[PDB]
Design a protein around this nucleic acid. Structure first.
Ligand SMILES: [Zn+2]
Length: 253
DNA sequence: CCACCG
DNA sequence: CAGGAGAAG
């Protein structure tokens, strides 16, 4: 689950419980139990996302930080319901009609307002690809900036200090869209390619967010052994940056 | 380069 | 049941 999927989840958490008084609050972790009574009768004011970090803001200036990594997932249920699952329950935020449940995530903590800028992940993250205020022109500047112009794309497009919310499927899909392998740096692109990359870094995540739940589809991710829809070569699966990697040898260079 | 499910 | 599927030491 990458930025698009986390923002879709956050939207569903807001539809379920934004603004509604909490009738019960439960945390599995011993260090979070102290906040249960403190949050009963408060409400979620909004669910913010910064890339894959999810920030559940409450009406008393606390914010729950959660990060699902590769395995966490939120579920929305009617209050009192809890469908059988083998997953470990980590957070329950309950209101009169709907409850939200966080399963499996291990990175969960309660933040005071000052920590929204000093928490180690929140301090390092770059601009979010789903932020409508972030433009292709600003992404082009970021690519060409001294800080990032010499970085290889293979790792750059996984690094949340560059653009928050990109993960491996988005890396693979963006590089195929612009015809590039991961072994390039922004300093070496021509202006047309840089512009194409800047646009794709925003437009593919935004299209996935809008339509994965003309609709988003994978062009190469998990399509090894299939013909590329652009040039017909057979898509390959390898590893890149210690993660799987999908690409087309006929049209990515 | 710690942390559910062929 | 070792190893595959976001991020930091
Ligand atoms: Zn191709």
């Amino acid at each position: 689950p990458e930025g698009p999927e986390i923002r879709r989840a956050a939207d569903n958490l807001e539809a379920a419980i934004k603004g509604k008084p909490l009738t019960d609050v439960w945390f599995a972790f011993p260090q979070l139990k102290t906040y249960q009574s403190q949050l009963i009768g408060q409400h979620v004011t909004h669910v913010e996302t910064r890339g894959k970090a999810l920030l559940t803001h409450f009406s008393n200036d606390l914010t729950l930080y959660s990060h699902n990594q590769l395995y966490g997932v939120w579920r929305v249920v009617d209050t009192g319901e809890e469908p059988q699952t083998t997953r470990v329950l980590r957070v329950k935020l309950q209101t009169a009609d709907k409850t939200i449940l966080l399963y499996s995530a291990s990175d969960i903590e309660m933040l005071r307002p000052e920590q929204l800028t000093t928490h180690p992940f929140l301090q390092r993250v770059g601009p979010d690809v789903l932020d409508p205020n972030l433009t292709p022109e600003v992404v082009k500047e970021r690519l060409l900036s001294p800080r990032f112009r010499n970085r290889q794309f293979a790792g750059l497009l996984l690094d949340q200090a560059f653009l928050a919310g990109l993960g491996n499927y988005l890396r693979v899909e963006i590089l195929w869209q612009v015809g590039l392998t991961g072994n390039h740096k922004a300093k070496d692109l021509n202006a047309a390619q840089l512009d194409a990359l800047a646009h794709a870094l925003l437009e593919i995540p935004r299209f996935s967010y809008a339509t994965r739940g003309a609709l988003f589809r994978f062009k190469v991710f998990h399509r090894d052994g299939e013909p590329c829809e652009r040039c017909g070569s057979i898509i390959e699966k390898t590893t890149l940056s210690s993660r799987p990697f999908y690409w087309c040898p006929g049209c990515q260079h």
